[PDB]
Design a protein around this ligand. Structure first.
Ligand SMILES: NC(=O)c1ccc[n+]([C@@H]2O[C@H](COP(=O)([O-])OP(=O)(O)OC[C@H]3O[C@@H](n4cnc5c(N)ncnc54)[C@H](O)[C@@H]3O)[C@@H](O)[C@H]2O)c1
Ligand SMILES: NC(=O)c1ccc[n+]([C@@H]2O[C@H](COP(=O)([O-])OP(=O)(O)OC[C@H]3O[C@@H](n4cnc5c(N)ncnc54)[C@H](O)[C@@H]3O)[C@@H](O)[C@H]2O)c1
Ligand SMILES: [Cl-]
Ligand SMILES: [Cl-]
Ligand SMILES: [Co+2]
Ligand SMILES: [Co+2]
Lengths: 384, 384
């Protein structure tokens, strides 16, 4: 097992450092800077928090001209990205500032691409052309979600065709990303808890592998996981604790690092199964990953028991799988999450439909264990 | 404690992937590529190993024209860098390939700088100008030493003035670095052992800190250390074991990462003390770090016993400092290293001189503990 790793995104970690917005705009723009401030809706919640102010005060401090463009919505649409390209060519924008989460970061990245291209940007999403340049964006992250502030990916939906797509390319890497743990404070409980589950589950999806010779990698992923297991419950009970939020934020960041996962083989079974639950019921990703992941490890405990033994020894101080699986169930409950699907009024009614749609045009799904339609129903039964 | 992190060096990790030399030259050169192959002496040992061949076979495979420039020597001299600038401007070299260790990588970086500048390169080392561009280098690392294949630093000595200096700048970052663990195999024992000590000591220098709120960081540094403690002895006894060499190489790399050390405050006391031992006697850095580090932790065990308790609990499975200090002494001996200075015929004769030269024009030295001249002699007495 060989692997490659690049990641050029500059990370500014900490608080009381709002000048680094302006400072980093200067470090990464073309000559004199004029920037596009991108946000969701009308900076409604960004401004409520006081980010909008502390942003514009950094922009002013550095004499940076700027236009605002708003209304991105959770599933960012080409409607708006096309509008954004227009503005970055007309008003000669030299840099984009994404002030939000992945929904706005993905929009920002797609604008950054189109602003430097002499074609349609959507040729970069539908596998027609491979972009070779981007204007350049900076992010101020408002919630440590899925790491788009450090990824090479942008997910956009063409609502004219109802066809959503993604574009992975080294140019999409943000030039810099401001990461202040303080943005965690105002996040509602259920969402903080679900973000904590997403961090662990991202680590676990990569940890549980058939790959061999991954000792150091194992250690690092174990280390991050343990911290999630130790601090995430403390953060839930002391929401404004900078330390607790720092560990957790730094964990999510590290979880999106492929220095700790070194070309070891990830498994997406849980993700996919959860996707289809979430596709039919109103259920937050992180919550369904806490219901499904335990069900899946029960169902897959026989593949490489040794790597399950290891997991629970290193993370929950136990060599007994059942006990460990329960310690993880308990830990999820420690974040205020109920563990069964019945609990959310999800019934067995669509376990069949959900299993079919997970598999799509395939016979099985998974890598650690090849899971067929009935295997998936069994897992949904374990989680009911 | 806030911190920043960038590192743009692409890492190609693994074996049986010699085509990625050519492939990565193509990915990072100007238009058609013509490269300078940089090595130590006359590719004497690089060629003995079979790197030279597998390099030129990748260069040919990709139709890459190339000139060779040799004779870099362990303390790379401007004599040669000036020669290299000449060649990269005359022969219009678009990229440099450093095939060696830090001595040649540092030379390569200094050539890369000068080849794009309209001045003297040495203005970049003597704090006159701050370089804003470099041609671009790739490294094939022959020994996982001090990480220059991923650093922003180049250390060159002007032998006309007997004045050596360094240049830290984001442009010095190699464009890519090939890391094949197999290069470990041929390394002599004393040097492999000393490289294993350097990895741990780089982690320890950063670990033992007065900084607070560093839990995740602690975990990661602990994780890497443990692996060094576990595999390094196995590697010493099974030199050609790819797994053992992979963990250890990946540890050194990770040790040079500031994602695991997150702006926590390093201490260089041991380094400095060792420097002066090495300045007077013929002693390999790694070996004197195994004699000195234990002496220093004995002498500094009273500062934050809690972080010593933690260290030895996480790494040596013990809460007792004395026992732990001994487990670390034992571990060093497990790499075939004798632990006293007497052992190397180093006598107390110059403990005084060595202490004075460590302190230079300062009253104390260290951050974890401020060490004065007598404190340093005491530490040298602990290590005698
Ligand atoms: N690399 C990639 O491109 C990548 C990878 C995985 C997922 N994604 C995408 O990530 C998106 C999920 O985004 P996300 O989880 O970062 O969140 P988000 O910002 O898209 O939405 C988070 C929710 O919490 C609120 N919120 C955000 N920050 C807050 C704060 N500081 N205080 C209070 N409330 C706050 C928002 O109003 C919203 O309701 C999806 O579109 C998903 O497809 C992208
Ligand atoms: N970031 C930086 O720029 C930075 C930081 C710290 C130290 N340094 C510098 O690093 C240098 C030390 O270099 P290094 O430790 O990487 O080693 P090196 O390559 O300079 O020398 C290593 C020794 O082992 C031999 N060797 C190397 N690879 C071998 C292999 N595969 N098989 C057998 N023998 C092999 C060499 O012949 C030589 O005797 C010093 O000049 C030091 O100042 C630079
Ligand atoms: Cl997610
Ligand atoms: Cl070193
Ligand atoms: Co997931
Ligand atoms: Co050192």
């Amino acid at each position: 097992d060989n692997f490659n790793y690049k990641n050029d995104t500059k990370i500014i970690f900490g608080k009381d450092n709002y000048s680094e917005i302006g400072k980093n705009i200067k470090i990464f723009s073309k000559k004199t800077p004029k920037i596009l401030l991108h946000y969701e809706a009308d900076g409604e919640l960004i401004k409520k928090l006081g980010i909008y102010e502390k942003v514009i005060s950094s922009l002013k401090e550095f004499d940076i001209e700027f236009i605002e463009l708003g209304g991105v919505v959770p599933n960012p649409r080409l409607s708006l990205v096309y509008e954004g390209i227009k503005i970055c060519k007309e008003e000669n924008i030299t840099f984009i500032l994404a002030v939000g989460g992945a929904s706005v970061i993905d929009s920002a990245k797609a604008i950054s691409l189109g602003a430097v291209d002499n074609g349609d940007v959507w040729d970069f999403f539908t596998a027609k052309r491979i972009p070779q340049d981007t204007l350049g964006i900076g992010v101020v992250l408002t919630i440590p979600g899925a790491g788009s502030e450090m990824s090479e990916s942008s997910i956009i939906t063409d609502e004219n065709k109802k066809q959503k797509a993604v574009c992975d390319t080294e140019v999409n890497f943000p030039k810099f990303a401001i990461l202040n743990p303080e943005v965690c404070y105002t996040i509602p409980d259920r969402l903080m808890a679900a973000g904590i589950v997403d961090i662990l589950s991202h680590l676990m999806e990569r940890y549980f592998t058939k790959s061999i010779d991954t000792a150091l990698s194992d250690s690092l992923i174990e280390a991050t996981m343990k911290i999630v297991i130790k601090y995430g419950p403390l953060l839930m009970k002391d929401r404004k604790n900078y330390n607790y939020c720092s560990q957790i934020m730094w964990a999510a960041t590290m979880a999106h690092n492929g220095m700790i996962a070194c070309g070891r083989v990830a498994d997406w079974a849980s993700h996919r199964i959860e996707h289809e639950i979430s596709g039919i019921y109103d259920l937050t990703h992180g919550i369904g990953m806490a219901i499904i992941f335990p069900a899946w490890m029960k169902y897959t405990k026989n593949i490489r028991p040794q790597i399950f033994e290891k997991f629970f020894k290193e993370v929950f101080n136990t060599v007994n799988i059942d006990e460990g699986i329960n310690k993880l169930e308990e830990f999820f409950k420690s974040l205020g999450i109920n563990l069964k699907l019945s609990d959310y009024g999800i019934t067995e009614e669509y376990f069949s439909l959900m299993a079919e749609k997970a598999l799509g045009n395939s016979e099985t799904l998974g890598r650690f264990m090849q899971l067929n339609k009935q295997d998936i129903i069994n897992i949904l039964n374990l989680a009911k």
